Amino acid sequence: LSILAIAGVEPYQEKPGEEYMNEAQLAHFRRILEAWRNQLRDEVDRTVTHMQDEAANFPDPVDRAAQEEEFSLELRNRDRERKLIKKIEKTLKKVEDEDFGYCESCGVEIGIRRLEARPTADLCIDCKTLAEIREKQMAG
Amino acid sequence: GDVISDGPEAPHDILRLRGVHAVTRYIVNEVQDVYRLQGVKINDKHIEVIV
Amino acid sequence: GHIINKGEAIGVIAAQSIGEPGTQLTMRTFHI
Ligand SMILES: [Zn+2]
């Protein structure tokens, strides 16, 4: 996953008698979270330089709509990344507060290998899936 | 004129609590932020006449 | 390039300058 690639971090590997959440593990997710955060910061920052050049040059009436189309895709995504960064920052608070690795609904613990894919996971598969079901029913 | 909570603040305050020159500087930079984010050069002079 | 002359109607020319590039801004609601 290019996420695991961005940091010089390798998937962890819980050893036989390793205690659950230890110092080495929180140091592991911190590097990934900062690197992921540092990569996201570069995407919002870069994007803008291209964005500033297009808005300065005035398109022809015919290509305003074609030029604008590429601008809208970028814009929407950026706000999601801002949300992602805010979710990462929120997840980064869970490490410092020593409350990382467990389901937020029920006290159940979230998998170690599960956290390496998406370190920002907040719930276990049971509570998370149930939540998505309630969603489709409470929404539509 | 200090920040007693966070979040964006209303320009109505800035003029009242911080000064005529304070609110004018708030606008010019926060409007230019949108234009200058888009690479558009509009000399502050103009935005000031609106102010 | 010289200084502004007496009588030039700067209010209008100010307004125009701001409103012309308005076509180049995103009228959705960008959020940085
Ligand atoms: Zn659960």
Curated annotation (Swiss-Prot), chain A:
NCBIfam families found in the cross-reference section: dksA, PRK10778.1
Top-level taxon of origin: Bacteria
GO BP annotations listed: double-strand break repair; regulation of DNA-templated transcription
PANTHER family reported for this sequence: RNA POLYMERASE-BINDING TRANSCRIPTION FACTOR DKSA, RNA POLYMERASE-BINDING TRANSCRIPTION FACTOR DKSA-RELATED
Subunit structure: Interacts directly with the RNA polymerase.
GO CC annotations on file: cytoplasm; cytosol
Miscellaneous field: Dosage-dependent suppressor of a dnaK deletion mutation. It suppressed not only the temperature-sensitive growth but also the filamentous phenotype of the dnaK deletion strain, while the defect of lambda growth is not suppressed.
The protein, known as: RNA polymerase-binding transcription factor DksA
Residues bound to Zn(2+): C103, C106, C124, C127
Family classification: Belongs to the DksA family.
Induction: Expression levels are constant during exponential and stationary phase (at protein level). Negatively regulates its own transcription, translationally activated by CsrA.
Function: Transcription factor that acts by binding directly to the RNA polymerase (RNAP). Required for negative regulation of rRNA expression and positive regulation of several amino acid biosynthesis promoters. Also required for regulation of fis expression. Binding to RNAP disrupts interaction of RNAP with DNA, inhibits formation of initiation complexes, and amplifies effects of ppGpp and the initiating NTP on rRNA transcription. Inhibits transcript elongation, exonucleolytic RNA cleavage and pyrophosphorolysis, and increases intrinsic termination.
Gene giving rise to this polypeptide: dksA
Curated annotation (Swiss-Prot), chain B:
Record family assignment: Belongs to the RNA polymerase beta' chain family.
Species whose genome carries this gene: Escherichia coli (strain K12)
Lineage of the species this protein comes from: Bacteria, Pseudomonadati, Pseudomonadota, Gammaproteobacteria, Enterobacterales
Protein task: DNA-dependent RNA polymerase (RNAP) catalyzes the transcription of DNA into RNA using the four ribonucleoside triphosphates as substrates. Resistance to the antibiotics salinamide A, salinamide B, rifampicin, streptolydigin, CBR703, myxopyronin, and lipiarmycin can result from mutations in this protein.
Gene that produces this protein: rpoC
Application of this enzyme or protein: Co-administration of salinamide and rifampicin or salinamide and myxopyronin suppresses the emergence of resistance to both antibiotics.
Assembly and binders: The RNAP catalytic core consists of 2 alpha, 1 beta, 1 beta' and 1 omega subunit. When a sigma factor is associated with the core the holoenzyme is formed, which can initiate transcription. The rRNA transcription and antitermination complex (rrnTAC) consists of RNAP, NusA, NusB, NusE (rpsJ), NusG, SubB, ribosomal protein S4, DNA and precursor rRNA; S4 is more flexible than other subunits.
Modifications the protein undergoes after translation, according to the UniProt entry: Acetylated on several lysine residues in the presence of glucose.
Listed name of the protein: DNA-directed RNA polymerase subunit beta'
